[PDB]
C-alpha cells in the first residue's frame, strides 16, 4: 500500500492549491483526506491547482491529497436508464445504488472526418412547425434559443416524449436549475411514460461551479457509450449559458486573466469541444448516432450577443422563439425568418419534402410582404393571394402543448394547405378544419395513412384529392 501524496496550501470558493504531487497527471482525479474528490487543472512549477467536486467546508490547510492514477471518468452502462444522477454518477433519487461496471473518459476525441456519414434519417418531434420548417435528423445538433418563458423546455420535453416507440435513448442534462424544477420535469416524464428510456443528469444551483462545468461532458460521455454500440441517443443540455457562467467563475478563481465580458479566452473552445462529439457514425463504425439539443437563454431577445453568436456558429441550425410572437397568439412561436436548419431536406420523409420543400422561404417572404403592405392602401391581386396564403399557413402551423401529431397527418394537412384546398376557408376556421380533417382521416382515410406510413411517399394525388373534396363537402363554415 503506497501512494504519491500532497499537502493543501490554500482552500476557498471551491479551489485548492496543493504542494507536492510530483507525478500528478494533467486532468487526473485526486481525493482529499475526508473523501471529497478533485481534478487537477493547473500543473505549475511548484504547486498544483485543484477544483473541488463537492463540499469544500471540511477541507483545511495542511490536509492530505492523494493521487488516484485515473483521468477524470464517469460510470456508464445500461443501469443508468430511468435514474437521476449527479455528474459523478452518484444517484440522487434515493432508489439505491447504480450497478455500472464500466467507465468512460470525460474528455475524449470527436469522431474524425472519415468516421462520419451524412445525416439522412429524420428525428420526429411531433411538432408541425419544427418538422416542416426546421427539420432535425439523427446526428444533427440543433440549438433552441430564446428568452425566458418562451417554451424551450416544453419543446424538449415533447421531443423526448415523442421518441417512445422509435427505439432511442434520451439523456436530459439540467445545469443550474432548481431541484424542484428538475423534480417537476422528472414527474412529467414519468407520467407520460418516457422514464423507461431516459437518463436524467442534474447539477442544481447550490452545487459548486466545477460540477456545473462538468455536467454536460458527463452526459455526452454517457451518450457516447451507447453511440459506439450502434444505438441512437438524444441528449438535451438545458442551459449552456449557465456552464458558461460557471466556467467564468472557475477561471476567475484560478487567477486566469479575463477577456470580453470577463469571460475566459477559450469560452468558444469549451462549447465547440462539447458539441463536436455529436455525430452520425459511418457504417464501418457501427452506424450509431448521437444528436444534441443545446439551450441558450438570451436577454431581451438579443440574438446577436456574444455567447448566443458563439453557440450559433457551432451548431447545425437554431430555433428562435420570440416573446412578441408568443403574446400575439402564435405558439410555439418560431420565428421562421431567423430560424434555419443546415441539414434540411435530407432529414425529412419523401412525402414531407414533396409537400414542404419551400415552406420556410414562403413564410419569410410572407412576413416581408405583410410588413410592406401595411404602408400601402391599394394592393393588387397577386399581393392579395400571397397574403391570404401566408395567413392561412401561419394559422395552420399553430399547435397546443402536449399534443403530438403523427407525420402522416402532418404531411396531409400540409398538402391540403399548399394545394389550395384551404383558400375558401376563413382564417378563423382552419384550426377546426384541421381537427375535423384528422377525425375524417381516422374514420375514412386509413388506406392513405397506411400508404404514407409504409412507403414514406405520397399516395396518388387523385384519390387524396377525392378524400379532401369529400371532407370539404362534409365540413360547414362558421
Amino acid at each position: 500500500q503506497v501512494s504519491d501524496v500532497g499537502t493543501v496550501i490554500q482552500v476557498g470558493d471551491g479551489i485548492a492549491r496543493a504542494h507536492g504531487l510530483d507525478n500528478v497527471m494533467s486532468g487526473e482525479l485526486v481525493e482529499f483526506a475526508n473523501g471529497v474528490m478533485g481534478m487537477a487543472l493547473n500543473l505549475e512549477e511548484n504547486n498544483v491547482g485543484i477544483v473541488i467536486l463537492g463540499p469544500y467546508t471540511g477541507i483545511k490547510e495542511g490536509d492530505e491529497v492523494r493521487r488516484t492514477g485515473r483521468i477524470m471518468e464517469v460510470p456508464v452502462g445500461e443501469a443508468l436508464i430511468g435514474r437521476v444522477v449527479n455528474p459523478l454518477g452518484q444517484p440522487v433519487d434515493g432508489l439505491g445504488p447504480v450497478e455500472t461496471t464500466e467507465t468512460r473518459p470525460i474528455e475524449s476525441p470527436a469522431p474524425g472526418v472519415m468516421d462520419r456519414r451524412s445525416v439522412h434519417e429524420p428525428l420526429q418531434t411531433g411538432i408541425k412547425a419544427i418538422d416542416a420548417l426546421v427539420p432535425i435528423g439523427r446526428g444533427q445538433r440543433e440549438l433552441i434559443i430564446g428568452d425566458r418563458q418562451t417554451g424551450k423546455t416544453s419543446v424538449a420535453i415533447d421531443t423526448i416524449i415523442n421518441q417512445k416507440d422509435q427505439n432511442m435513448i434520451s439523456i436530459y442534462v439540467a445545469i443550474g436549475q432548481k431541484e424542484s424544477t428538475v423534480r417537476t420535469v422528472v414527474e412529467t416524464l414519468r407520467k407520460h411514460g418516457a422514464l423507461d428510456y431516459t437518463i436524467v443528469v442534474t447539477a442544481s444551483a447550490s452545487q459548486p461551479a466545477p460540477l456545473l462545468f462538468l455536467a454536460p461532458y458527463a452526459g455526452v460521455a454517457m451518450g457516447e457509450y451507447f453511440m459506439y454500440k450502434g444505438k441512437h441517443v438524444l441528449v438535451v443540455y438545458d442551459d449552456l449559458s449557465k456552464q458558461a457562467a460557471a466556467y467564468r467563475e472557475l477561471s476567475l478563481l484560478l487567477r486566469r486573466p479575463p477577456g470580453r465580458e470577463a469571460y475566459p479566452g477559450d469560452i468558444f473552445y469549451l462549447h465547440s469541444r462539447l458539441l463536436e462529439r455529436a455525430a452520425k457514425l459511418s457504417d464501418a463504425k457501427g452506424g450509431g448516432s448521437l444528436t444534441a439539443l443545446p439551450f441558450v437563454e438570451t436577454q431581451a431577445g438579443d440574438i446577436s450577443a456574444y455567447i448566443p453568436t458563439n453557440v450559433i456558429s457551432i451548431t447545425d441550425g437554431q430555433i428562435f422563439l420570440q416573446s412578441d410572437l408568443f403574446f400575439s397568439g402564435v405558439r410555439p412561436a418560431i420565428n421562421a425568418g431567423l430560424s434555419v436548419s443546415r441539414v434540411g431536406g435530407a432529414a425529412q420523409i419523401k412525402a414531407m419534402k414533396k409537400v414542404a420543400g419551400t415552406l420556410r422561404l414562403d413564410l419569410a417572404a410572407y412576413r416581408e410582404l405583410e410588413a410592406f403592405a401595411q404602408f400601402g392602401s391599394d394592393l393588387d391581386k397577386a399581393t392579395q393571394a400571397k397574403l391570404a396564403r401566408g395567413a392561412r399557413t401561419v394559422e395552420v402551423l399553430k399547435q397546443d402543448l402536449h399534443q403530438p401529431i403523427p407525420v402522416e397527418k402532418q404531411v396531409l394537412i400540409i398538402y391540403a394547405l399548399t394545394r389550395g384546398f384551404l383558400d375558401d376557408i376563413p382564417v378563423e376556421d382552419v384550426r377546426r378544419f384541421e381537427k375535423e380533417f384528422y377525425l375524417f382521416l381516422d374514420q375514412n382515410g386509413q388506406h392513405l395513412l397506411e400508404h404514407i406510413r409504409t412507403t414514406k411517399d405520397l399516395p396518388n394525388e387523385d384519390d387524396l384529392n377525392k378524400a379532401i373534396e369529400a371532407f370539404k363537402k362534409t365540413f360547414v363554415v362558421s
Binding site: 476557498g12 490547510e61 440522487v92 425566458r148 444551483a205 476567475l252 478563481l253 487567477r255
Partner: protein, 471 residues
Amino acid sequence: MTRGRVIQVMGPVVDVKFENGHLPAIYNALKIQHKARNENEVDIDLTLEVALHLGDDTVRTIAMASTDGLIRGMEVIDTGAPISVPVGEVTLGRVFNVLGEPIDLEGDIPADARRDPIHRPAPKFEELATEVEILETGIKVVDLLAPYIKGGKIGLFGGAGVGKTVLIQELIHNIAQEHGGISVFAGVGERTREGNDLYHEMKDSGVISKTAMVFGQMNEPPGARMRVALTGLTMAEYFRDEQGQDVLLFIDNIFRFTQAGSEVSALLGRMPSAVGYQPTLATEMGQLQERITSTAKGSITSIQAIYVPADDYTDPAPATTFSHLDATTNLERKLAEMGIYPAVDPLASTSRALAPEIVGEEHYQVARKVQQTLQRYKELQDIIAILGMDELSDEDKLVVHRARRIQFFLSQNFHVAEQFTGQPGSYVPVKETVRGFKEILEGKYDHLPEDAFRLVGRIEEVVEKAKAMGV
C-alpha cells in the same frame, strides 16, 4: 491552545494567524474581546466569520460589525462552530439582529436554549414537494395574469421608488393577517424607519404574536448585511421541519445580500467579474435560495422584493435571480409615472400557475386575450407617438380603445395606500376580476370614459364613478 492573533485589518476584512494544526474551519465564528489597556485604546467586542485559508496558518475573515479600534496582535477566540441563533417558540414575538441577539428590549434569551448553525446544506432531491396550488391575494393584475403559487417562491422586481415596499405591505395585510401559520420577516439593507413602522403596525394589529423579525438594515456593515437573511432562513426552517408548519417568509430586499457580497469580495482578493460583481455571484445566490423550499414535512412560501439598479433589468444581480422564482411581477417607472398603481408590467410578469388545468379554461382564455390586446397596443406606440390616432385603421382604433381601458382597469386602490390618499382600499375576488375583464373585452363598456376605470376595484365601481362624474 486555539488562540489566534490579528495580522491585517483592511476595512471589514481581518486576517488572523493561528498555531499549526489548529486552524478553524470555514464558516466558523471567531470572537475578539479586548479591554482598553490604557487611554490610547478602546474596548472591543467583535465577531468574525472565516472565509478563506490563505496558507501559512493564516485565515481571512469577514467582520460582523465595525473594525474601528482593532490593533495588530489582538487575541482571537475560536468558537468551533458557525454562528448559532435561537430557534423555537422563544423567537415568536421577538426582534433579532444578525447574531441572534434580541433588540426589542424585552429581555435576553436564556443561554441553555436550543440554537442552530446558520450554514447548512440544502434539502435533498427526494425530499421535495412539487404540487401547485393557487394563492389568492385580492390584487387584480396578480390574480389574473400571474397567479401566486402556495408554497412557491415569488419575486417582485423594481427600480428606486416604484412600489416594492408598498406591494409587500399590501400582501402582508391581505394574506398574513389570516394565514394561521407562522410568519417570518427579514429586513435586509432597508430603512430603519420602515422596520420601526412595521413593528408598530404588527404590534397594533396583533399579528406580532405569531411572527419573528430579523433586521440587517442599511446602516450595518456588509458582513451583517450578508448573514441576516441566513439568520432569518434558519429561524424559518425550524418551523418548517420540527413542527410541520406552513411558513410565510418575507424578505425586504434580497438584492442587498449580493450587493454586500460584492462589497466584501474586492478586499478578499478575488478578481472582479463582468460589472464589478464577485465571481461567485451565482453560487452564493443558489446556496441561499435552494434552502428556501417546500418539503414533505412542511411548506415555505416566500415573497421577496428584488431591487433593480438603475432600472437595468439586464444587470447580473437581477438577471441571475430569475431562474429561482416560480412567479415574478415586474414594476415599471413608466407605468408608475402615468398614475397606474401597483404599476405591474402585464407582459413581462409571468407565472408557472397560468395554465388551463390549474386556473380554469375561461380564466386562461381571458388572460391570453388581454395579453394579446396589450401586445398589439404596444406595437403601435411609435405611430401614436409621432402622428397620433388619426391615421390608424378602424381595427387598430378599436384595439387602442379597448387596450387603454384594460390598462387602466388593471390599476387598483390598496388598503395600505389610504395614508397617501383618503380613498379606502378594496379586495377583489378572482371570479370578479375574470368577469370584469371578460365584459371589457366583449365591448360592454366602450361608451364609458377611460378615466372612470382608474383605481376602483370591482367592475360595478367603474359604472358608479362614471355616473358620479359626467356621463
